[PDB]
Each structure stands twice: as C-alpha cells, then as structure tokens.
Design a protein around this ligand. Structure first.
Ligand SMILES: Nc1nc2c(ncn2[C@@H]2O[C@H](COP(=O)(O)OP(=O)(O)NP(=O)(O)O)[C@@H](O)[C@H]2O)c(=O)[nH]1
Ligand SMILES: [Mg+2]
Ligand SMILES: [Mg+2]
Ligand SMILES: [Mg+2]
Ligand SMILES: [Mg+2]
Ligand SMILES: [Mg+2]
Ligand SMILES: [Mg+2]
Ligand SMILES: [Mg+2]
Ligand SMILES: [Mg+2]
Ligand SMILES: [Mg+2]
Ligand SMILES: [Mg+2]
Ligand SMILES: [Mg+2]
Ligand SMILES: [Mg+2]
Ligand SMILES: [Mg+2]
Ligand SMILES: [Mg+2]
Ligand SMILES: [Mg+2]
Ligand SMILES: [Mg+2]
Ligand SMILES: [Mg+2]
Ligand SMILES: [Mg+2]
Ligand SMILES: [Mg+2]
Ligand SMILES: [Mg+2]
Ligand SMILES: [Mg+2]
Ligand SMILES: [Mg+2]
Ligand SMILES: [Mg+2]
Ligand SMILES: [Mg+2]
Ligand SMILES: [Mg+2]
Ligand SMILES: [Mg+2]
Ligand SMILES: [Mg+2]
Ligand SMILES: [Mg+2]
Ligand SMILES: [Mg+2]
Ligand SMILES: [Mg+2]
Ligand SMILES: [Mg+2]
Ligand SMILES: [Mg+2]
Ligand SMILES: [Mg+2]
Ligand SMILES: [Mg+2]
Ligand SMILES: [Mg+2]
Ligand SMILES: [Mg+2]
Ligand SMILES: [Mg+2]
Ligand SMILES: [Mg+2]
Ligand SMILES: [Mg+2]
Ligand SMILES: [Mg+2]
Ligand SMILES: [Mg+2]
Ligand SMILES: [Mg+2]
Ligand SMILES: [Mg+2]
Ligand SMILES: [Mg+2]
Ligand SMILES: [Mg+2]
Ligand SMILES: [Mg+2]
Ligand SMILES: [Zn+2]
Lengths: 314, 129, 123
RNA sequence: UAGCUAGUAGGUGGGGUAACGGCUCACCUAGGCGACGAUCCCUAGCUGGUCUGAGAGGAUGACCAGCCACACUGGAACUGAGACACGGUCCAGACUCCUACGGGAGGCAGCAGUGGGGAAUAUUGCACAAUGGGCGCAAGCCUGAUGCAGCCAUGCCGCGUG
RNA sequence: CCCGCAGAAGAAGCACCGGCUAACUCCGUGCCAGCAGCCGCGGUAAUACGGAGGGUGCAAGCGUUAAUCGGAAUUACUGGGCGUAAAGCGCACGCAGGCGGUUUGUUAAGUCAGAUGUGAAAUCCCCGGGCUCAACCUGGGAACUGCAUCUGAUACUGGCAAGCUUGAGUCUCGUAGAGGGGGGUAGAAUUCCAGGUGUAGCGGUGAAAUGCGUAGAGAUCUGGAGGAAUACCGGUGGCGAAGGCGGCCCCCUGGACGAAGACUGACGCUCAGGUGCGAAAGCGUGGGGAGCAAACAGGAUUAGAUACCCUGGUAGUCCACGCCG
RNA sequence: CUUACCACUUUGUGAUUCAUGACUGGGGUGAAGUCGUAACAAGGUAACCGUAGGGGAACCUGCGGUUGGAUCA
C-alpha cells in the first residue's frame, strides 16, 4: 500500500504542488494533492492519509484525497483569475493596518464591505502606534473612532514594544482569525508577538523601503493560538477591489446606511446627487462619516473601471 | 581579382546561352583556343575565331538546335582552389558518356573518349553536356 | 567552407552524449536504495510515481523508476537498475529490474511476466 | 599548453660498442627544435584486420596471425650466440610467511583454482595417441604448448518435439 | 557411423496487437492504479492501464538494457549552409599563408604512361572439393584500391630566364563634395544680471496643485554676461572604410571622379595572428556649465505612483588629455 | 680500502593533481500557491540594442541607435 488508513485533517498551509496537513493527532506533514481537487486553501478540512513512515529516517509525502465542504471562506476577486479564496472555515477577520507603510481609509472600507458580504465578523487593529507621537496618537484616534462609533472593535497595538496587545489577545481567544491587510503593516510581527513562537521559528520580516513595504510572507499558514483558537498569517495585498460584488451589496456593506434605506424620495436613489437622498443630508449634518461616503462613491466608480474584463466571476 | 580565366570562359558561354545571345567574346588564350577547338570538334559550339595580335580576342558562335541551348550544362571541375587529376582508368564519364569531359593530357587537350582511347590520364578541365 | 579552410582545420564531428552516464556502458548496475519516495508526473499525466534514489557501486547516486503495481523496496535495499528513459518523470533515466535480487516480481502478473520477473504460473 | 633546449646542435681528438653515432669525455664553435604545432597536459599498445556503410567514410583492435612492451615496485649487472632474463642473480621498498627473535623464504599478468571487485566470464580433468619444441646416436625422457574432455543457449548452423 | 527393440511415446516458450507496425473484443478500473521507443493513453462503452478470449511475429529461444555504424546530406571530400530559421568579425590596413593576367624558352617538382620490386599468411570475394546438409574446413584464383624505384610523356600547375600590357600603379589638366584637424567670426534664440515703463497676477494641466509675484512678478524696452547649437538652403542630396560629417571665413590635410596622352611592367586579390580607427553611455584628472536632464526633492492621479503628468534639479551633456572598445 | 656513476631516502621548498570540506553564488526542472500583471493589438506610456542610475518583483527613467512599430494629405 505504501500509505496509512485515511483520516480527517486540517490544512495548516498550501504550497502549490503540495500542502501542509495536520492530522487530528496534531502532527503536521507535507502531503500531495490529487488532480481532481480544484480548490484547497488554508483552514480547509480534508480527508487525507499519510505514507508509511520509513524513508531516510524521515517521513514520506502523504496524499490528500478530498476536501470537506467549507463553512465560511474569505475570497478576493482577481483579474485574469476570477474570485479566489484565501482561507476557508474562518470565523473572524482582523483588518491589520499600520501608519508607516500606508494609511488607507479606503482599503479598510473595502475589507469591511467584503466581510459584510461574507457575514464574517471583522475587527480593526492599527499597528506600530510606537512610531506616532502622542499628538499624532490623538490625531489618529479621532478618526479611528469613526468605526467604533458604528460598533466596530478598534484596537491600537505596537508589535515592537508589545503595547496594548492584551485586549487583542482577549479578542483573539477561542476563535479562528485570519490576519489580513496590506504588505508591511506588521501582520507577521504581530503574530510573532502574540503567538510567542520559539525563537528558532519566526515569520519572515523585512522593513519597508520608500513608499511601500515588501511582500515577505507569500503563503497563508495556520497557527494554534496559545490560549485557545487559531490564527492565520496571510500574504500582504495591494488592491482589495470589489467588481465581483453587485453595487447594491456595497450599500449593504456600509453598516451606517441601513439607518436611511427607503428614506430617499427617488426609490432607485444612487445617493450621490439624486434629490432627496437621505444619506446625503445625513452626512451633511455629520451623522455619517464624510470619508465613508466618499469612499463608497469612489469604490462604486472603481467598479466601472474594472468591469472592462469579460471574464466571469460566478 | 580575375584568378581563373577558364572558369570565366565557361561562365561566359553559360550566361550567353541563358541570355540567348548569338556570339560571345573572351580575351583569348592558347588554352582557351584549345578548349574551343574541342567543343567545335564535338559539335558543342558552331565555330570560333581569334582576332587582334597584341590583345587578341576569342569569339565563339553558340548553337541552338531547337532555339534551346545546345550546351545545356557546363561546369569547371578542376579549379585553382582545388586541382583534379585522374588516371586513365578512372577517367570520368559525363551523362554516362552521352556528354563529354575535357581533359588536358600530356599529349594536349582532348575529350575523355580520346584520352582513354589513347591510354592517357590528365587534369580534368571541366564537364560539358 | 573553402577546402583551404578545411585543411587549416578539419570537420569536427559531433560526439553523442549518453543518456545513461551512470551505467558506464554496462548493461545493468547494482545499487542500494538510500531513499524510496513518491513523485508527480508532467502536466498531461497525474499520478504518484514510485521511485527510489539509489547509491550505485561506482559511486554514482541516481533516481530509478519502479515498474508494476506495488514494490517491497525500502531503505538499504540492494537492487539492480537498467537503462531507459521516463518521459513524464524529469531527471529519471533508469528503471529497476523487477525480480533482481532484492525486488520481487509483481504479484499475480499474468501477461508480460518476463518484463517484471514473474515466473510462469504453475499450470 | 608558445616558446623549448647547454651534451643541448655541431667540430676535433681520446675512450667505448659487434657495429655508425654526444654512446662517453676533454676542448672548440653557438648552435638546434617550433605556428608544416616544438614543449607541456590528458588519453592510448600498433597492424593484418573486425563491425557498419553502395561508396567515401564511421566505430574499433575481443578471437587468430605479425610487431612491441612488461613479469610484486625501483635499480644494476653477471652468464651467455642471444637476457639486463615470468617459474635466474644482487640490492632497496611494501606486503605475506617461518623463527630458537639470532635471522631467513616468497612473487599465478603460465594451467587449473581461492578470496576480492563486478551486471558478468568455465575444471584445483585426461594424454603425450597425433603436430610442434628441448635434450639424446638412438631407444626414450620432458612438455598445463598442443590434442581432447568438463561447464555455460554466449554466438552461428542443423534437427526434433510427430 | 551402421544395425536392432519398445513405444507417440521423453521434449514449446517468449514478446506484441492506438499510429508508426502484423495482429481486437469483453470485463475490472475511472487523471486512481498504471503504460509508454516517439506521438501519446486513463475522469463511466479504455481496441493504449490489469485480467480473460482471440490474433500477430519469432521460436529453443524470446524479450529488455548497453554499445557501434546506418538511416543522418545531422561535420555535407564524395555531399550542407550564413537577408529574416544557427551563422558576414563594427570597419580598415597588413606580415605569414592560400590563390594568381598573357607570350616564348628551359626544367620535369606536381601530374600522366610503361616496366620492375613489394604489398606475410589468414580474413573478404569467385570457381571448385570434403564433413549425410549447413555452419565449418579446404584447393586455386581474384583482390590487397598502397608504397618504392627506374624509363619516358610535357598539355596543365610549380620552378628558372626573357618578354607583353589588357590587371595594378605613376604623371599632366580639371570637377564636385556636411571628408578630416586647427583658429577666428556672425545672426537668431534660451537663461541670467542691471536699469526704464507699469500692475496683479504669473506659470502649469484633461483638470489641478507644487512653484514664482507687491521687495513689483509675469509683460515690454534698453544695456550686459555666459554657454550650447547652426531655422531657411535641405533633398528619395553629397562626402567618408565604418563609427559618422550641416552657419561663414582662413590655414594644414585625405580620398573619389572625368578627358586625352605618356610612363612602369603582374608590381595583384584575400588575410589567421598583429596594428589602427571606432555612436551613445561610463571612468581619471582639470576646466566650463545657457538649455536639457538619470539620481533626488515636491505637487497631483492612484490601494500605492516608488511611473506616466507637473514644479524644480545633481552627475552628465561641452572643452583638454588619457581610458573604455 | 678508497674515487666515479647511482636506485631508495631526509630536509628546505616550489609547482601540479586528487579526495574531502566549513561557508556559500547563481542555475535548472516541477508546479494545480502568493503579489502584481512585464510582453504579444498603437498590449492600453511602441517594442527592442548598448550603457548608467533606481526599485518586492516582473520592471521605471536618462543618453544614443534600429524598425524587427501601428496611425497619419
Ligand atoms: N517601527 C515598527 N516596526 C514594526 C512594528 N511591527 C512590525 N514592524 C516591522 O515592520 C515590518 C513588517 O513586515 P511584515 O510583518 O512581514 O509585514 P506584513 O504586514 O506581515 N506583510 P508582508 O509579509 O507582505 O510584508 C518588519 O520590518 C517588522 O519588524 C512596530 O510596532 N513598529
Ligand atoms: Mg493571479
Ligand atoms: Mg507577513
Ligand atoms: Mg482586455
Ligand atoms: Mg669520435
Ligand atoms: Mg677511435
Ligand atoms: Mg593503458
Ligand atoms: Mg550513407
Ligand atoms: Mg586506433
Ligand atoms: Mg583476452
Ligand atoms: Mg599481482
Ligand atoms: Mg658475455
Ligand atoms: Mg626484456
Ligand atoms: Mg627464465
Ligand atoms: Mg609465476
Ligand atoms: Mg589463472
Ligand atoms: Mg615428438
Ligand atoms: Mg614434469
Ligand atoms: Mg547448444
Ligand atoms: Mg495495423
Ligand atoms: Mg478514451
Ligand atoms: Mg470500460
Ligand atoms: Mg490490455
Ligand atoms: Mg491474451
Ligand atoms: Mg554522415
Ligand atoms: Mg543546413
Ligand atoms: Mg530572431
Ligand atoms: Mg538569425
Ligand atoms: Mg558587416
Ligand atoms: Mg597563370
Ligand atoms: Mg605563388
Ligand atoms: Mg605511375
Ligand atoms: Mg594476404
Ligand atoms: Mg559439398
Ligand atoms: Mg611554365
Ligand atoms: Mg616596355
Ligand atoms: Mg583578425
Ligand atoms: Mg561621450
Ligand atoms: Mg568627465
Ligand atoms: Mg569634474
Ligand atoms: Mg522631470
Ligand atoms: Mg503623493
Ligand atoms: Mg581639439
Ligand atoms: Mg501590459
Ligand atoms: Mg507597453
Ligand atoms: Mg525613477
Ligand atoms: Mg548606425
Ligand atoms: Zn439617497
């Protein structure tokens, strides 16, 4: 046979031709994949079987036969490729942003819209607050509160000084949390700080140069949380554009808009300059975050630019 | 520079036959005269004549039995870059003896037929068909 | 081109590169399996090829294919390899002689038995 | 791999060899070889031939025949018509063997055969009946040359299994 | 080797069957297991995987691997190529070398002819002979395509001698040319400085912003300073070996072409090594620096702009001498 | 007993070669991963050549060159 009896297992990480699979016993192994399988990402739950463990005193590659149906999944549309998933069976995403690499009220909004379409509970963290001066901290908090004023969990943590992680640790316990965000924001460093993994094994960490940082982590790897649950390190991303999502799904994604649906005199209210747009005046009096409204409009107009492709995303 | 007059004469004949000329003219030579005599004897060329004394010129009258060139193939075999000498027994045969190979033997310039009938080997000047 | 050029330097023919250098023109060689592992083929083909990396007697180390369904090969196995080429296995240019002094024949093989070291069934 | 060479290349004289010769020596000359590849480096016994090819060529040198070189490694000579000698001598070295530790013995790349290496290659056979060879007047003796036998489907050819 | 006895009695396997390539169907399987010399097969009827039946080929052998030649004209002597498929050095000069116009004489080196000697036997081939045939052994012949020597032949190539002028070169007279090196000079234009007038914007983009302007910008006039390049002519134009060369003038200098005539008399072509020239960028030292502009600074766009765009701007761009090649 | 030649050997060294090798540089192949999409149409700022600078990456910019670039009375 040259292989052991089949068993259930999780996908700790995917590396092209072959992935890393953890058995229920908790031992991880490199395992190949059958060509019949089409999609297989981190967090997937698969039926696999290891090879007979006698070769050069080390383990031989296992084979993964099939994957179980995903419960949840985090996907992202890719030009030339369609929508592709990053990690499945996820319970919570943590949008990791940092002031130095880039400050983007636009990427955070795109992520919020996405996770709202995916029903996954989000949480905003802002890394490297050590770089900002105390005045600058008071200058970043009065717009980080934009989201905590609509309930979003907003935390500020310094990975280098391990400052204020402790609430992040608490929010991370006993759940499955994918660390997502732009490259250089500190997702790997934050994981090193939180996991407290052995010094011999650490995620790659290169410093940013000029306008933007490198793409160090090119993989998505699961990690077992010390207290309880699991986190997932993800590769940095540049554009989280949303052309696959329908335009209405973007209005739904902004949670501060349900307070004004059906209050626009024109029923098909595009809400930009159409008369009687409730959210227009709502943002006129400051009920809505101006930046959020402008971001909504600009991502809508961005969808027009990226609708040029005739490929399908269904 | 001109480093082989015999190949020049051959190609003059060839291009004259192709361009359907009536008569060609080379700067004459004793050797050129002898080769022309062979092709007149073999009915390859109708006639040849030498004019002038200080700068003599040889003139050849090309044949055309059906308007098509009588000499349909002609090529220099022993060139200055590589000389070719054959012994009497291994003398060549052009078109299996239908054509004529001109060879310079110790007894002058003669057709392969005359040469091997005289039992003499020599430098193969060229093949005329 | 010119005969003079050929004289100044003659035409050098093209010597052939042997596609089985580890054989040293020997029809077969003997080695010991240092590692048995499963590999993947080229894009047209999908499979778990059973191959073994073998340290040869003449100091050479090469990867060899194992024909037939199943093998009893493990680490420290004295096998005999033969020349050949596997198209879909890049870098595998040797087979294993099924039935050669460590590797047994294929079980219940009935046709082309000689190609797998399977003695004639008693009948 | 572009320079190499000082007994180097010549000459005279002496010596030496069976024989010519820097073969050797004294002196003299300053040459000699090299791009038509010297020197250096790697590889390699050569040929008749063998395989292939229409031929030119290509590959190659297993068997048989001719030549060469070698006989554990290095060196030297003796004896002799012929040797610097496979089963002769001396020395030195390595290894193996005997030892009374004082010293001694040996050389299968002859025929069998053993271990080892290898994918792989055979009997520790019979006879000098024949052909050769050595010695002998001869008879005859010797001959793992040779003639035969043994083993192997290794090849070619033939036959059967109706 | 011959005779006798018994009894079909003691004696058949291996590979292949998708095409190449002779030979096809069922079942199992289901991109798995597996096959495969090359193309290739396998995801639900697989003639390609495994088993079975049937068939094809060979046979005491059959297959696989290794190795050589062939096919392969795929090292092209026989018998290949180089505009775009691999392949003309960036260009030139030039030693060795290869090749060499035409006539006469001589020589006989090459070349050819004849003769002789030799090219061991075996092996290869042909006609025979002997093993019951064959393999095998064997007689005779042919062949061994080679080498050497001697005697001749003199057409061609080579050598020698004497020529000849058609190749090559010289001279006389002129033509055209951004050919080259050096030195002057001119006129526009950009920028800068100083001053005159004078107001509030200028500048830039698709739109803007950065930037400059009330100390007066921008605009306009006058004067000055400096650097770089030479509208129009201008061309499908010319010159140069190539790279390249563009205001005008002077000095030095190379080549090309034309007419006629004289002169020399093969003095020629090509060229491995070698030597030289050789766009731009770049390097060293020292000047110079108007404009332009890698790097860099800034403003926009953008997820970002690390680019395109905008405002600036260093090296460099220019000169001298070297280097790079 | 001496002298000459001289094999072996010992140093001081030089050259060269083999085996191994700490520690590394790039490469190749697979490829159903990741980040963007560099080129192919004027590939959406024409590509490419030489050179210099810059940058996670394909690449960007300057200088000169080519058409093996579309459109353009
Ligand atoms: N000053 C500062 N630097 C930090 C802090 N946290 C992390 N960094 C540094 O910022 C860089 C972030 O790299 P990394 O963690 O790999 O980035 P990422 O956001 O995980 N994404 P990617 O892997 O694509 O680069 C590293 O150099 C890391 O050490 C912090 O709190 N302060
Ligand atoms: Mg993609
Ligand atoms: Mg990371
Ligand atoms: Mg498109
Ligand atoms: Mg003497
Ligand atoms: Mg004497
Ligand atoms: Mg040898
Ligand atoms: Mg042939
Ligand atoms: Mg040889
Ligand atoms: Mg032998
Ligand atoms: Mg020995
Ligand atoms: Mg004696
Ligand atoms: Mg001897
Ligand atoms: Mg002896
Ligand atoms: Mg012996
Ligand atoms: Mg022996
Ligand atoms: Mg006798
Ligand atoms: Mg005896
Ligand atoms: Mg037999
Ligand atoms: Mg068929
Ligand atoms: Mg099918
Ligand atoms: Mg079926
Ligand atoms: Mg089958
Ligand atoms: Mg069958
Ligand atoms: Mg050939
Ligand atoms: Mg060709
Ligand atoms: Mg090309
Ligand atoms: Mg080409
Ligand atoms: Mg050229
Ligand atoms: Mg001549
Ligand atoms: Mg000459
Ligand atoms: Mg002769
Ligand atoms: Mg003979
Ligand atoms: Mg007979
Ligand atoms: Mg002459
Ligand atoms: Mg004269
Ligand atoms: Mg040269
Ligand atoms: Mg320059
Ligand atoms: Mg400079
Ligand atoms: Mg300077
Ligand atoms: Mg600029
Ligand atoms: Mg910006
Ligand atoms: Mg100057
Ligand atoms: Mg593109
Ligand atoms: Mg482009
Ligand atoms: Mg740049
Ligand atoms: Mg040019
Ligand atoms: Zn509205």
């Amino acid at each position: 046979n040259l292989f052991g009896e089949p068993d259930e297992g999780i996908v700790i990480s995917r590396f092209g031709m072959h992935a890393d699979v953890e058995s229920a016993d908790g031992d991880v192994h490199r395992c190949n994949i059958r060509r019949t399988i089409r999609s297989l990402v981190t967090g997937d739950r698969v039926v696999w079987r290891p090879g007979k463990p006698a070769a050069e005193g080390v383990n031989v590659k296992g084979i993964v036969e099939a994957v179980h149906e995903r419960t949840s999944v985090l996907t992202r549309p890719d030009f030339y490729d369609g929508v592709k998933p990053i990690a499945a069976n996820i319970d919570q995403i943590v949008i990791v942003s940092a002031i130095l690499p880039e400050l983007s009220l636009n990427i955070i909004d795109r992520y919020l819209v996405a996770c709202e379409t995916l029903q996954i509970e989000p949480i905003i963290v802002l890394n490297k607050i050590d770089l900002l001066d105390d005045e600058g901290m008071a200058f970043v908090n009065e717009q980080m509160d934009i989201y905590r004023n609509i309930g979003y969990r907003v935390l500020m943590v310094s990975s280098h000084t391990q400052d204020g992680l402790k609430p992040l640790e608490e929010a991370l316990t006993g759940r499955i949390s994918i660390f997502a965000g732009q490259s250089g924001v500190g997702k790997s460093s934050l994981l090193n700080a939180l996991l407290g993994l052995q010094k011999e094994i650490l995620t790659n960490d290169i410093s940013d140069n000029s306008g933007l940082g490198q793409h160090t982590t090119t993989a998505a790897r699961l990690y077992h949380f010390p207290h309880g649950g699991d986190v997932i390190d993800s590769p940095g991303v540049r554009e989280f554009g949303l052309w696959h999502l329908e335009p209405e799904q973007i209005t739904q994604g902004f949670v501060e808009f349900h307070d004004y649906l059906g209050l626009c005199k024109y029923r098909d209210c595009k809400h930009d300059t159409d008369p009687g747009c409730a959210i227009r005046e709502a943002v006129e009096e400051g009920k809505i975050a101006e930046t959020r409204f402008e971001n909504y409009h600009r991502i809508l107009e961005s969808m027009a630019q990226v609708k040029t492709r005739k490929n399908f995303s269904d | 520079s001109m480093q082989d007059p015999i190949a020049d004469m051959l190609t003059r004949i060839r291009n004259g036959q192709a361009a359907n000329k009536a008569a060609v003219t080379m700067p004459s030579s004793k050797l050129k005269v002898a080769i022309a005599n062979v092709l007149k004897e073999e009915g390859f060329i109708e006639d040849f004549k030498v004019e002038g004394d200080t700068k003599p010129e040889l003139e050849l009258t090309l044949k055309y039995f059906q308007g098509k060139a009588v000499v349909e193939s002609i090529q220099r075999v022993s060139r200055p870059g590589l000389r070719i000498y054959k012994r009497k027994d291994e003398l060549p045969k052009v078109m299996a003896g239908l054509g004529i190979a001109v060879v310079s033997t110790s007894k002058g310039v003669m057709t392969d037929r005359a040469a091997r009938q005289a039992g003499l080997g020599g430098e193969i000047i060229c093949y005329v068909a | 081109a010119t005969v003079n050029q050929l004289v100044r330097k003659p035409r050098a023919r093209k010597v052939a590169k042997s596609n089985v250098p580890a054989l040293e023109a020997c029809p077969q060689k003997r080695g010991v399996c240092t590692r048995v592992y499963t590999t993947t083929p080229k894009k047209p083909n999908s499979a778990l090829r059973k191959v073994c990396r073998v340290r040869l007697t003449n100091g050479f180390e090469v990867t060899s294919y194992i024909g037939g369904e199943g093998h009893n090969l493990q680490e420290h196995s004295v096998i005999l390899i033969r020349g050949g080429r596997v198209k879909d296995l890049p870098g595998v240019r040797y087979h294993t002689v099924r039935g050669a002094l460590d590797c047994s024949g294929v079980k219940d093989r009935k046709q082309a038995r000689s190609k797998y070291g399977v003695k004639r069934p008693k009948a």
